[PDB]
Scaffold this motif. Structure first.
Motif, PDB file in Angstrom:
ATOM      1  N   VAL A 173       0.054  15.907  -6.464  1.00  0.00           N
ATOM      2  CA  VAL A 173       1.008  15.072  -5.745  1.00  0.00           C
ATOM      3  C   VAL A 173       0.584  13.613  -5.808  1.00  0.00           C
ATOM      4  CG1 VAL A 173       1.674  14.454  -3.400  1.00  0.00           C
ATOM      5  CG2 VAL A 173       2.073  16.772  -4.242  1.00  0.00           C
ATOM      6  N   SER A 174      -0.711  13.344  -5.633  1.00  0.00           N
ATOM      7  CA  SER A 174      -1.203  11.973  -5.739  1.00  0.00           C
ATOM      8  C   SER A 174      -0.904  11.388  -7.111  1.00  0.00           C
ATOM      9  CB  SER A 174      -2.705  11.936  -5.472  1.00  0.00           C
ATOM     10  OG  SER A 174      -3.430  12.079  -6.680  1.00  0.00           O
ATOM     11  N   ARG A 175      -1.267  12.124  -8.163  1.00  0.00           N
ATOM     12  CA  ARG A 175      -1.104  11.599  -9.512  1.00  0.00           C
ATOM     13  C   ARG A 175       0.367  11.326  -9.800  1.00  0.00           C
ATOM     14  NH1 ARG A 175      -0.989   8.821 -13.666  1.00  0.00           N
ATOM     15  NH2 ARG A 175      -3.236   9.101 -14.001  1.00  0.00           N
ATOM     16  N   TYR A 176       1.237  12.301  -9.534  1.00  0.00           N
ATOM     17  CA  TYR A 176       2.652  12.089  -9.807  1.00  0.00           C
ATOM     18  C   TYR A 176       3.278  11.059  -8.878  1.00  0.00           C
ATOM     19  CZ  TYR A 176       3.316  15.630 -13.367  1.00  0.00           C
ATOM     20  OH  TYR A 176       3.289  16.340 -14.542  1.00  0.00           O
ATOM     21  N   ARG A 177       2.653  10.780  -7.731  1.00  0.00           N
ATOM     22  CA  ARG A 177       3.111   9.684  -6.889  1.00  0.00           C
ATOM     23  C   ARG A 177       2.728   8.340  -7.484  1.00  0.00           C
ATOM     24  NH1 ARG A 177       4.415   5.552  -4.637  1.00  0.00           N
ATOM     25  NH2 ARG A 177       4.480   5.229  -2.374  1.00  0.00           N
ATOM     26  N   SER A 178       1.655   8.301  -8.271  1.00  0.00           N
ATOM     27  CA  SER A 178       1.261   7.048  -8.903  1.00  0.00           C
ATOM     28  C   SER A 178       2.273   6.552  -9.932  1.00  0.00           C
ATOM     29  CB  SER A 178      -0.108   7.198  -9.562  1.00  0.00           C
ATOM     30  OG  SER A 178       0.023   7.455 -10.949  1.00  0.00           O
ATOM     31  N   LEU A 180      11.582   3.099  -5.100  1.00  0.00           N
ATOM     32  CA  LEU A 180      12.020   4.466  -5.355  1.00  0.00           C
ATOM     33  C   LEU A 180      11.448   5.436  -4.333  1.00  0.00           C
ATOM     34  CD1 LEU A 180      12.046   4.750  -9.232  1.00  0.00           C
ATOM     35  CD2 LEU A 180      13.751   3.925  -7.620  1.00  0.00           C
ATOM     36  N   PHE A 181      10.245   5.163  -3.831  1.00  0.00           N
ATOM     37  CA  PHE A 181       9.643   6.028  -2.822  1.00  0.00           C
ATOM     38  C   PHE A 181      10.442   6.009  -1.529  1.00  0.00           C
ATOM     39  CE2 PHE A 181       6.593   6.042   0.810  1.00  0.00           C
ATOM     40  CZ  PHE A 181       6.393   7.402   0.850  1.00  0.00           C
ATOM     41  N   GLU A 182      10.938   4.840  -1.133  1.00  0.00           N
ATOM     42  CA  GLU A 182      11.653   4.710   0.130  1.00  0.00           C
ATOM     43  C   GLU A 182      13.159   4.879   0.001  1.00  0.00           C
ATOM     44  OE1 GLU A 182      10.542   0.910   1.630  1.00  0.00           O
ATOM     45  OE2 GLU A 182       8.578   1.572   2.353  1.00  0.00           O
ATOM     46  N   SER A 183      13.708   4.811  -1.210  1.00  0.00           N
ATOM     47  CA  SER A 183      15.154   4.797  -1.392  1.00  0.00           C
ATOM     48  C   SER A 183      15.722   6.107  -1.916  1.00  0.00           C
ATOM     49  CB  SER A 183      15.545   3.661  -2.341  1.00  0.00           C
ATOM     50  OG  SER A 183      15.023   3.883  -3.638  1.00  0.00           O
ATOM     51  N   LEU A 184      15.026   6.777  -2.831  1.00  0.00           N
ATOM     52  CA  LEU A 184      15.578   7.967  -3.465  1.00  0.00           C
ATOM     53  C   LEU A 184      15.735   9.104  -2.463  1.00  0.00           C
ATOM     54  CD1 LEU A 184      14.095   8.289  -7.057  1.00  0.00           C
ATOM     55  CD2 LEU A 184      16.267   7.367  -6.255  1.00  0.00           C
ATOM     56  N   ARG A 185      16.895   9.759  -2.508  1.00  0.00           N
ATOM     57  CA  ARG A 185      17.205  10.882  -1.636  1.00  0.00           C
ATOM     58  C   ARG A 185      17.870  11.980  -2.450  1.00  0.00           C
ATOM     59  NH1 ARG A 185      15.043   7.803   1.392  1.00  0.00           N
ATOM     60  NH2 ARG A 185      15.826   6.593   3.168  1.00  0.00           N
ATOM     61  N   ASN A 186      17.709  13.217  -1.995  1.00  0.00           N
ATOM     62  CA  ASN A 186      18.352  14.372  -2.616  1.00  0.00           C
ATOM     63  C   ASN A 186      19.624  14.667  -1.832  1.00  0.00           C
ATOM     64  OD1 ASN A 186      18.775  17.085  -3.901  1.00  0.00           O
ATOM     65  ND2 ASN A 186      18.088  17.768  -1.878  1.00  0.00           N
ATOM     66  N   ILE A 187      20.768  14.319  -2.417  1.00  0.00           N
ATOM     67  CA  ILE A 187      22.059  14.513  -1.767  1.00  0.00           C
ATOM     68  C   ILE A 187      22.956  15.480  -2.514  1.00  0.00           C
ATOM     69  CG2 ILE A 187      22.298  12.484  -0.303  1.00  0.00           C
ATOM     70  CD1 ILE A 187      23.167  10.885  -2.609  1.00  0.00           C
ATOM     71  N   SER A 188      22.689  15.743  -3.790  1.00  0.00           N
ATOM     72  CA  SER A 188      23.522  16.675  -4.537  1.00  0.00           C
ATOM     73  C   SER A 188      23.218  18.122  -4.179  1.00  0.00           C
ATOM     74  CB  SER A 188      23.343  16.452  -6.038  1.00  0.00           C
ATOM     75  OG  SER A 188      21.992  16.166  -6.350  1.00  0.00           O
ATOM     76  N   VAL A 231       0.853  -1.183   0.000  1.00  0.00           N
ATOM     77  CA  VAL A 231       0.000   0.000   0.000  1.00  0.00           C
ATOM     78  C   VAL A 231       0.890   1.234   0.000  1.00  0.00           C
ATOM     79  CG1 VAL A 231      -0.215  -0.152   2.512  1.00  0.00           C
ATOM     80  CG2 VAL A 231      -1.803   1.265   1.203  1.00  0.00           C
ATOM     81  N   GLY A 232       0.613   2.164  -0.912  1.00  0.00           N
ATOM     82  CA  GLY A 232       1.396   3.370  -1.044  1.00  0.00           C
ATOM     83  C   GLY A 232       0.745   4.559  -0.368  1.00  0.00           C
ATOM     84  N   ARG A 233       1.564   5.564  -0.065  1.00  0.00           N
ATOM     85  CA  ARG A 233       1.091   6.736   0.655  1.00  0.00           C
ATOM     86  C   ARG A 233       1.867   7.958   0.195  1.00  0.00           C
ATOM     87  NH1 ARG A 233       4.505   3.962   4.003  1.00  0.00           N
ATOM     88  NH2 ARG A 233       6.162   5.183   5.004  1.00  0.00           N
ATOM     89  N   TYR A 234       1.262   9.128   0.389  1.00  0.00           N
ATOM     90  CA  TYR A 234       1.930  10.381   0.068  1.00  0.00           C
ATOM     91  C   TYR A 234       1.504  11.453   1.061  1.00  0.00           C
ATOM     92  CZ  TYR A 234      -2.515  11.427  -2.217  1.00  0.00           C
ATOM     93  OH  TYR A 234      -3.847  11.621  -2.491  1.00  0.00           O
ATOM     94  N   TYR A 235       2.388  12.423   1.280  1.00  0.00           N
ATOM     95  CA  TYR A 235       2.124  13.483   2.243  1.00  0.00           C
ATOM     96  C   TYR A 235       1.198  14.536   1.654  1.00  0.00           C
ATOM     97  CZ  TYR A 235       6.336  11.446   4.273  1.00  0.00           C
ATOM     98  OH  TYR A 235       7.272  10.578   4.784  1.00  0.00           O
ATOM     99  N   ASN A 236       0.284  15.031   2.479  1.00  0.00           N
ATOM    100  CA  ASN A 236      -0.592  16.106   2.042  1.00  0.00           C
ATOM    101  C   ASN A 236       0.162  17.434   2.061  1.00  0.00           C
ATOM    102  OD1 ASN A 236      -3.486  16.615   1.272  1.00  0.00           O
ATOM    103  ND2 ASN A 236      -3.287  18.114   2.927  1.00  0.00           N
ATOM    104  N   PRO A 237       0.008  18.257   1.028  1.00  0.00           N
ATOM    105  CA  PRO A 237       0.773  19.503   0.961  1.00  0.00           C
ATOM    106  C   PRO A 237       0.359  20.492   2.039  1.00  0.00           C
ATOM    107  CG  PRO A 237      -0.094  18.885  -1.191  1.00  0.00           C
ATOM    108  CD  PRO A 237      -0.802  18.045  -0.181  1.00  0.00           C
ATOM    109  N   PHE A 238       1.320  21.328   2.426  1.00  0.00           N
ATOM    110  CA  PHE A 238       1.105  22.499   3.275  1.00  0.00           C
ATOM    111  C   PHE A 238       0.654  22.138   4.687  1.00  0.00           C
ATOM    112  CE2 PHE A 238      -0.281  24.335  -1.019  1.00  0.00           C
ATOM    113  CZ  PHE A 238       1.028  24.458  -1.419  1.00  0.00           C
TER     114      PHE A 238
END
Lengths: 101, 101
Positions: free
Chosen positions: B68-73, B79-87, B1-8
């Motif tokens: 956010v929901s659509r682009y999370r689909s 990739l949801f749990e692994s990708l990080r912004n490090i650069s 089951v996937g989840r995404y944060y609500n904006p703001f």
């Protein structure tokens, strides 16, 4: 405007809750006022054996030649003194009191 | 089951910010004294700015949530749990942030 709350916060609020919030802030113009009815001098056309009535404009009582609310002068003074949209300053209050005047 | 944060930081159930004392905090900032013992210039300016931003977010959270929901689909859970912004390539300038809000 006066209380600085969003439309979403007050959407579920009823008439009574909205009135209390406005009155606590110092805004007394939260009530509707009925309009008196003046009987016609002559019987209406196509209405046999009946009387006619029309509302007096501006909620002004013909007998007293006054607005129906007799505390309007004191209500406007209260608005001018009070503070809206800001903790300090009378920019909002004096503008509306002058306009309603 | 996937989840995404609500904006703001807006709770979908309550349709408002997670902090329930935000109006009280804005009023506190308004009445407070910062950078000057006498005069509420900074407090009033910041309170007005924050109130405007809060109104905009409260009005527009829905479309951002849908996007956010659509682009999370499109991304899987790895990739949801692994990708990080490090650069650090994607930063926001303070002017851009305050203008955006």
């Amino acid at each position: 405007f006066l209380t600085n709350t969003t439309y979403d916060i007050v959407n579920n609020d009823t008439i009574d809750v909205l009135k209390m919030k406005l009155r606590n802030q110092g805004w007394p113009f939260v009530e509707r006022y009925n309009a008196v009815e003046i009987d016609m001098s002559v019987e209406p056309l196509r209405s046999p054996g009946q009387v006619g009535r029309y509302y007096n404009p501006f909620n002004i009582d013909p007998l007293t030649k006054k607005h129906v609310e007799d505390r309007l002068e004191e209500f406007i003074n209260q608005v001018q003194v009070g503070r809206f949209r800001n903790a300090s300053g009378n920019a909002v209050g004096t503008t509306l009191a002058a306009f309603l005047r | 089951v996937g989840r995404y944060y609500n904006p703001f930081n807006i709770d979908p159930l309550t349709k408002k910010h997670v902090e329930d004392r935000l109006e009280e905090f804005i009023n506190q900032v308004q009445v407070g004294r910062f950078r000057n013992a006498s005069g509420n210039a900074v407090g009033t300016t910041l309170a007005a700015f924050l109130r405007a931003c809060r109104d905009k977010t409260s009005a527009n959270w829905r479309g951002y949530s849908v996007l956010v929901s659509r682009y999370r689909s499109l991304i899987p859970n790895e990739l949801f749990e692994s990708l990080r912004n490090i650069s650090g390539e994607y930063n926001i300038n303070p002017q851009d942030e305050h203008s955006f809000f």
